[PDB]
């Protein structure tokens, strides 16, 4: 997230610095967050540990 956030910070920054007619709204910043937040969520949702599947052993069946 630090790498991603730093990249978007430059995007938001340089609009703040180099814009001639910037609106004092932060819209470029607002949209940048949703990208990082979405990046965080999918990264957060990832599980490093492998899931165990439902064990289904074909147990022995003997006639009664």
């Amino acid at each position: 997230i630090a790498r991603v956030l730093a990249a978007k910070a430059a995007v938001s920054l340089r609009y703040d610095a180099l814009a001639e007619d910037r609106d004092d709204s932060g819209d470029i910043g607002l949209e940048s967050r949703a990208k990082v937040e979405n990046r965080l969520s999918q990264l957060e949702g990832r599980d490093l540990r492998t899931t165990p599947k439902v064990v289904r052993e074909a147990k022995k069946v003997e006639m009664t």
């Binding site: 979405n38 969520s41 999918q42 949702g45």
Partner: protein
């Protein structure tokens, strides 16, 4: 006119649609809390369209 021409006419009339992939509705869980579920259906159609 011939029936084959009419067949190619059907085929030309047909139009594309947005197919559904595995990673199309994963983001719904992210925004599943405190949302009017009508709005959830509207988002479903928006992604589907």
């Amino acid at each position: 006119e011939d029936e084959e021409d009419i067949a190619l006419e059907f085929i030309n009339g047909e139009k594309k649609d947005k197919l559904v992939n595995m990673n199309s509705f994963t983001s719904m869980f992210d925004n599943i809390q405190n949302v009017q579920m009508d709005t959830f259906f509207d988002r479903v159609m928006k992604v589907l369209t």
